[PDB]
Structures are given as structure tokens and as C-alpha cells.
A paper describes a structure:
Calreticulin (CRT) is a 46 kDa soluble multifunctional protein that was initially identified as an endoplasmic reticulum (ER) chaperone for monoglycosylated proteins and is also involved in Ca2+ regulation. The globular domain is made up of seven concave and six convex β-sheets forming a legume lectin fold.
As expected from the mutation design, a new crystal form has been obtained, with ten independent copies now present in the asymmetric unit. The residues of the conserved lectin site (analysed below in §3.3) do not participate in the packing interactions in this new crystal form.
Residue numbers in the entry:
A (entry chain C), B (entry chain F): 19 to 207, 302 to 367
C (entry chain B): 18 to 203, 303 to 367
D (entry chain A): 18 to 207, 302 to 367
E (entry chain I): 19 to 203, 303 to 367
């Protein structure tokens, strides 16, 4: 089982030597390390938290490059919109190793984008975007994302038969084939759409009105079963204690 | 969070000094340490396996005694009927510390009995039995147990307001109040039914026709959230890889 | 002639639920239940309020027609039974002014007097006698040992208008003196303009304590009578039933 | 674009009496009155809340639409004028959570932040900056001198989501730094959420005064530093020169 | 084995909720979490580092109180004077639970003080101090401490027969009986209550790192833990430092 990338932010400020802030603009919001006001475990549940309102963010982590050619690609992470978000992204981008991390921005060329996007009551959507022939192609299926304040697990699975699966909280919510669920081409044909020569950076590149979202437990792997295990060892261990602590705070607030 | 008992059989043959065979009869079947023919992890998934057909079994483990008076009691363990069982029990019993472990048998006085029981096409049931006023009182709700070959998590939660909950695979399948869901009394009124002065031994005391059932990951605790965590760190880590290995063996069999 | 300001024996089934009020100051207070426990002198008479949950704060109270002890003897009396062999927890009462909001009662609510047994581990087996004076809660300076076995014990506080006091356990004096000598107060120290509520407001690790036979009166002799009609009637049969259960346990 | 969470200039006659609430926690609180005092830049503009009684506690507060500073800059700003040449008394504000019962406000009510000048005798001329954290009221460890003459002075506190702060007097910086360094909150790096409060709903004047006569005016709670500075120049900055001129004239007449 | 206290600072900033700064003075030096310039493992070898020169320090950790009465008491921790110290303490103090951690200072009443003290070429000494009858009684044996830049394990063993042993780097350096090796005025060894471990000390050149604190009643367990901590640090630390010394020379 290949682990191309793992990040749990368990080693204090260690993460500040693994991630790079884009300088494309001077006024990007800053991520901070935090487990927020409630959590399952104060230390384990530390992740990157958006710290400023109405800002663009642009922070990224490089890893030893790889190709998903001939293989399964699994992209997984947790997202927690502690602040009860009104409008903002919670998605990740996988970039070719040719990306200059210090110049990353909204129009930098990525391979794949994946994850939750919220904007008002009307948009609660999971993006699955594939870059193909210089276009960023959006999935045609409507996948609802989570919108409460708790930690949710997001998983994208992409297979070399051009099938894909999306999971939320380790449970399937959408499935199918690339050729059907995106408009890449007028008719069937190109079995290589799923495949990228090179993956070298994972970026958080996004916009937020109300800030406070925490990203944790990032995993890039080629094994679906391992992804599921890791999901149960991370999200699955956070879940119940987080909910208990938050119920308790809600009750005290009410009094 | 109090952990009154935990057993995962992770330290080789260490378990043989924690569990005691009843000598009440000379012909009890024997438990053996085994992860069986398929598993998620050959080592982690070791547990106690029934090794002989058409036998009574009687093995138990003592722990520092406790009372659940004024507190939540959670009893949890995994069961795997690898052999595709026809008829046999998969339940545990919690006994007072006054039990002589070398004389344990079917008629020994327990406090609580909990878990799956299978007998032919008609019976796939989860027992929840409370000992009260010298009677063993059986739950009136019909709870279906699992019957496939895979590992399943069984959880009983008993609370000091006389509520209870039963979970399978970390997900609620039944809930209510002791006074409603058992015939202890003709009408309501004994709020202490849930409570026992002492718990000192967990026993596997049961009958099996076709043998091969594996018991693992026993937990007795006072914390529902911790039980759920441990469930996701045990069953939740076994699940996907176990299924994948077994599908592979089924496919090889078909050829 | 004796004035009875408050009496509670929990003799009329669930009648008590309309005389006592649960504080809602917090959402996770432990709950009292009506019970005579596993052993008793009389299954019905020895019903009282039992703490039902471990490691919890409790806050339950009862009102009565307000009164003042000014110019009078005040006697506060009740039974306490730590069935569970308590490790750490209170068994004391508090007398409050009628200005107390019973639905907001908690550890920091202002009381007039606090009285009764407090146990915490090997070191503490003590009877509290606390007087509220000049916005301070003043603790008795004498060391009074409380009972700690599993049986029912009678606790009695007597306060007199010459500022003398007496403490009794099981109807027998264990301590006495004057307010001015036995507390560090900043002449009617003893006196309160009004009493309107009795509260059980306390903490408990191991739960199972039973409170019964509460009495507030102005007559020492009557308190002693009532003690002998309640505790004194419980005592022997309770001990006998428990001895029998201990013997069966051993076999 | 700047958010204005609270503004009070007392420009609309007795209108303020429907925006502020007196605590009844005690029966003998001093009373605020509307006044521009004996000298002023403009008789009407410079009306504010004046302490009217000697040797008293005061407890008056105003609500606003609740907000959180989470992920944002918080600016708290107001003018203070100790006309009476104060001997001993507070001139500071408190920002409270919306859970405060205004009719029970007092010295021990739980606030989020306290900010402003405190004078007591020759030794104490100090600007308080207090943060409530983990049930403690933590006092700034830097020594900031307040103004003590009879004129109107502008007090501004700026708190930023990187846990930096700045204090200004008369629109000019007098102190700055980081929350982790300038208060004793906790060991190590610090806690990136210290600056942040889930909610702000009430501004209170809750304080003690020997010699009375202090006037509070031109309150502003905003999320924009630049706007705070503008408003400061449109209020204090417009009061300043005329106030000083009228007072010089009165001092000269007094001499003759 | 009873483990009354263990601290390895393995859980990021988790330690900031276990340790309390004294406010007795306003100008105490500040401890910072760090593995320094060289180490065996960047993560494991994080500990509390003194961060300022010519300062008093006063930081403490409470634990569930206990008594050593009728038992062995073992106090153990690692000390690394990375800065090549000129003058400064590297010792711990065990306090009764009656200590106000927010007022801890040099004159607070402790039960036992133990560990290295360096001041100039003349003083390289291991303190073992027992509080008895309101006096702080100093061991009368001369125990040399380590003074290089590397991580060293310090272990004090006190037994209910009034014997004691001192180890450096898991190897005995001193032993005897309380009655012979101190001038006390039979349970000298015993204290009713232990509730706080404090780092309360003075330092000229700063940079000392404390890690791997252990309070236990089992000598063998202390030795095991020493080998799993100091014993796992030692070789890789030395390797990394040799490499840095060579590069510095060129
Ligand atoms: Ca994490
Ligand atoms: Ca196992
Ligand atoms: Ca009764
Ligand atoms: Ca005005
Ligand atoms: Ca360490």
C-alpha cells in the first residue's frame, strides 16, 4: 500500500517546515494550527484553521511525485466548519510537480480538485473537477456536502478503469464512470482520462467569508481499504467525543 | 473513563494466564487462539476460537470488581462466525465476583447475558438478559443478529435512568427502558433494576454445533463515547481488509 | 405548644414530588429517588431521598412557611444513611432565606446555616456547622467526628437565643458551647430574619445516601421524641436485617 | 465596507434614554446625566454622559446587535473628559457577552474585555487593558500612562486576529505588541484564539468615582482601524481646539 | 509498578495544560519547547528549554498526590546542557501538594531536591537534599555531575530501609544510608505527601533541555524507561553533533 502523503499535524509546529505560503498576493489569509473550541482530543484534532474573514487562502505541501497511471488513486481528508460557515470552500487541489508553490493561486493549473463547497442555503456541494485538454471539467452529478459544525471525512477514489467513487464519513454517496459523469468528449472513448503523469503538491487554495474551518488527517494513497482504515482511526476516533463535548457546551450556553 | 476490562489477545500466548477453563465437566470444548482462514490482519485479528463441534464451552476472565450503581455500563466485543454457523451462541455473560471460575457452567448465576444467538432458519436473535429476583428475564424486543461469516461488533449500553441501547457495528439497532422492554414487574416502579453490586468475571459459556466462531476485542467500560472509539479502532480497522481477503478467496474457489 | 416549621418523612407515596423542587441551575445535577435501599428496619417507613448517580452535584429543596428564630430555640434534625459505604461526599443540609429561588439553587447560593456530616477519604469524617454572618460563611472551630458506617444515623443541631448551641448524633450530645467561642465571628449572631427553604445541595462520588425524617422545630424535647420515634424505631431491625444479609453473603 | 457594531454620540436630545439601561443590582448607584459641561468645543456636539454624584458606583449599559470578532479586527474607541480634575475614579468601558442581564450589571459581572483610563491619586494614572480568559480577568503587564488634565481625550483599543494589539491616545499610538507577550495567559507559544470572543452584545460603564463630573462621548465599536481613526478626527479632532480656546478664556476671566 | 508522574512532551503543545508558571516574580525566564540544534530524534527529544540568560526559572507540574511511606521512591529525568553551561542548576524539586504553584520560588518548602548543579570549573556537583525538621539537609558525599553538551540521565532512588542510590546514565555513582550520608537531627526517608514536581533554579548561560521525567516506585521500571528514553537518544545525538563540529571546523 503506497502512502504518497500523510499529514496529521501531530508534531507541534513541525508542519511549518512541510507547507509553503503562496506570495502571489500580499493579502492572503493565514492558516493557524488549532483544534478549536470543541474537539474529541485537544491534541489529535489539531489541524489547519482559516483565521481571517473574507479572504483568499493559498497554502500547499509537496511530496515525492507520483503518477496514478495504471493504479487506484485515493484522496482523503477531514473538514470541520466549526464556525457554521455561510460561504466558503473546503476543498483540496492536487497539482503537478511543475507548480511554483510560492506563486500558487486560483488560476494555477491543477490536475484534480475535490471537496466541499458551501455558499448560502442554495449551494452545499461536493466538487469533483478534472483537468483535461486545458479545461477544468466539473462533475455533472449533484453531491450534497455536510454543513453542520462537526468533523467530516471526505474521500475520493479514482480507478484505472475510469470508475470513481465519492465517500463522506466512510460511506459511499456517489459513484460512476468518468466518461458518463463529466462532459469530457461528445461520445465514448479516451480510456486514459483518469490518469496524470505527475502529482507533486497538495494545495488549499480557496475563498472564505466566515473563517474557522479546520482541515486535518490528509491522506493520499493507492489503497481503498487502507484509506478506510485510516478514516476509522482518525475521523472515527474523533467523532463521538467531539459530539459529546459540543452537546455539553450547547447545554451550558442555553442556561 | 473507566476501563474495567479489555482483551485483544495481542501479546502472544499471554491470554492463557488471564482466562480460566471451567472443570465443571470433563468434556467441554476447547478455545484456541486463532485469526482463522481470512482476516484483516493476521496478528490483530487473533481471538478465541471454538475448536470442536457439538460442545459446551466455558472459559472466563476475572477483573478488578466493580459496581455499575449510579453509572453507565457498556459491554462490547466482536464476534465472527467464520464457519457459517448453523446453531450456536455468540454471547457473553457478566458474573458476580462470587463465581468460582473453575466451576462455571450453564446454570451458574450471572448478572447479565448479552449477545448473538443462532439456531437454524428461525432464530437470529440478540439476547439481552437481566437477572432479577432470582429470575433470568429475557428482553421482549426482537433484535436480529448478524449471520454472515464476517466480524461484527456487539455493544450493550445500560444507564442509571434504566435506559438501554443495543448497537451492532457501532450503530444503534434497539433502545428503550428496562421497565417497558422486559417483564420484571406488572407495572412501573423499581428504579434500581439496572444495577448490580458487583461484577468480577466475564464468561464465554455457551453451546455450539458447528464450531469456528472467533471472539475478540472485549471491552467493559462506563463511557459510551470511548466504547465507540475502541469499536472503530478494532472492528472498524478489521472490516474492509477482511472483506477484501475473503472476496479474493471466494473468487479463487469459483475457478 | 412546640412549633413544627417543617417535617418530612416521605410516608405518603409519591406525595413528596409536590413538596420538593429540583434546581435547574445546571442541566447535569444528579437525581434523587425515593427508596428504602437494600436493607432497612421497615420497607415503607425507611423510604427517603436517595442519591442515584455517581460523581454528581445534587440540588433539591423544600419550602415551608417562613419563620424567624429570633428570641427562640432553633432545632434542625434529620437522618442520614450512607448505605453504599461512602468514599467521598456530603450528607449535610442547608437552611436558606425565603428569598432563595429554588429553581436556581446551587453551591454558591446564600444560605443562613449549613449542618451535617461530610466525608472525604481517610482524613475527613466531620460534622459541619456553618453560620452565615456579615457575608461570610463561618466554620465551626471544634472538630466533631461524624459516623461513617452503612447504618442510619440521627443528626441534630440546637441553637439557642443565649448563643449557646449543641450538636447531637443518635440523640446523644457530642458537642456543645457558645457561638462566640467556637467560631471566629467578625449579640444576636444566632438569629436570622427568615428561614423559608431547606436544601440538599452537595457533591457525591459514590452515590446511594438516603436522607429521611427531616424536622425543623423550636423544641429540643420534641426533637428528641421525634428522633426516638423515627431513628429509634429504625435502628435495631435495620441492623438485624443487615447482619442476616452479611451472613448470607459469606456463604 | 467597515462594520459599525455600535455608535453613540448623544446627538438626538433625550433619545439616549431609550438606548441605555441602569442596573438595579444596587439601590444607591450614582446617576449619569446628559451634559456638555462648563466648557466645550460645541455646546450640542459635546454632550455626553456625565457622572453626577460624588463617591458612587455607576452602572449603565447599552446593547447592540451581537457580533463576534472571530477572524476580524476589533476596535473599541471613545472620548473621556475629566472636567472636574479628578482625584480618584475610573473612565473605562467594558464589553460584555449578550448573556449579560443589563438590569443586574455590577463590578463582578463577567465581561469579555475592559479598556480605558483609571486614576487614583498621585500614583495611578493608568490605561487598563483587561482580557477575560479561562474565567480569569487578565491585566496587561505593560504600564500605559493615561491623560489626567481637564480636556477631552480619545482612547482607542485595536485587537487583531493575529493576536496583535495597539493602544492609542488622541489618535496616536502609545502602546503595542502581542497578547501572548503582554499578558500572562498561559505557558508556551500561546493559543491562537485568545483575542476572540463568541459574542459581544453590551457596552457598560461600570465604575467607581470620588469626585464626579467625567463626561463620556463618541463611542465607536468597529472592525476597521482606518475608520476608527477617521471618526476620531471627526469627533475628538473637531472638539479639541475650540474646547481649549473656550477654557483658556474662562481661566483668564477667573484670574481677573 | 506505580507511575506517579511521566512527562516526555510527545503530544505537541499538550504540555502547556500540564505545567504552571509561577507568578511570584514578574521577570522569571521562560521555558520553551525545543529539541535544540542537535538531537537523536527531532520529535522525541523535545523538552523544556531555558530560553533566557541570567534568569530565575519557576515552572511546575502537579500530579495525583502520593506518599512514599513503606515504599521505594524513584525520581528520574534527562538533562542536556546544550549551551556548554558556565553556571546554572539542572535539578528538580518534589513538593507537597500544599504548594501554590503560582507562587513557587527559591524559598518555597520542598520535600526533596535532586540533580546537577554547575558553577564554574570548581562546582560540578549532584545535589541530594532532604527536608527534615524544617531544615534542608545537604548530602555530605561529593558526587560529580556531567558537564558536556550531551543528554544525561539522572536517577535518585530512596528506599524504606533508609538506603538510597544515585545513578548517572543508568549506572550507579553513589550509595549508602540516610543516617550516615546526611547530618539529620527512623522514617527520615518518608513524606506524607508529594503533589508537585518543580523546575526552580537559576541560570547564566541558558539553553538547558529537560525531558523524560519519571516518578515511580519501581527501580527496574525506572531503568527500563531510562533505556527507552536516554538510551535511545544517546548514539544518534552524538553522531549528529560530531558532524556539526566537523563542519564548524571547516
Ligand atoms: Ca490532527
Ligand atoms: Ca485480537
Ligand atoms: Ca421515611
Ligand atoms: Ca456628543
Ligand atoms: Ca521528549
Amino acid at each position: 500500500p503506497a502512502v504518497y502523503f500523510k499529514e496529521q499535524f501531530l508534531d507541534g509546529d513541525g508542519w511549518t517546515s512541510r507547507w509553503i505560503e503562496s506570495k502571489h498576493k500580499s493579502d492572503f489569509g493565514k492558516f493557524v494550527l488549532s483544534s478549536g473550541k470543541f474537539y474529541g482530543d485537544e491534541e489529535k484534532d489539531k489541524g489547519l484553521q482559516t483565521s481571517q474573514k473574507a479572504r483568499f487562502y493559498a497554502l500547499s505541501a509537496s511530496f515525492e511525485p507520483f503518477s496514478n497511471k495504471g493504479q487506484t488513486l485515493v484522496v482523503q481528508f477531514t473538514v470541520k466548519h466549526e464556525q457554521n460557515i455561510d460561504c466558503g470552500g473546503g476543498y483540496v487541489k492536487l497539482f503537478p510537480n511543475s507548480l511554483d508553490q510560492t506563486d500558487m493561486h486560483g488560476d494555477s493549473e491543477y490536475n484534480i480538485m475535490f471537496g466541499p463547497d458551501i455558499c448560502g442555503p442554495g449551494t452545499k456541494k461536493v466538487h469533483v473537477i478534472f483537468n483535461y485538454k486545458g479545461k477544468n471539467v466539473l462533475i455533472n452529478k449533484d453531491i450534497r456536502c455536510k454543513d453542520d459544525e462537526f468533523t467530516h471525512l471526505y474521500t475520493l477514489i479514482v480507478r484505472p478503469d475510469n470508475t470513481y467513487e465519492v465517500k463522506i464519513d466512510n460511506s459511499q454517496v456517489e459513484s460512476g464512470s468518468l466518461e458518463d459523469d463529466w462532459d469530457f468528449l461528445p461520445g465514448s472513448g479516451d480510456p486514459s482520462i483518469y490518469a496524470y503523469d505527475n502529482f507533486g503538491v497538495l494545495g488549499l487554495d480557496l475563498w472564505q467569508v466566515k473563517s474557522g474551518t479546520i482541515f486535518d488527517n490528509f491522506l493520499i494513497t493507492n489503497d481503498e481499504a487502507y484509506a478506510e482504515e485510516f478514516g476509522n482511526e482518525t475521523w472515527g476516533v474523533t467523532k463521538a467525543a467531539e459530539k459529546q463535548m459540543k452537546d455539553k457546551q450547547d447545554e451550558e450556553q442555553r442556561l
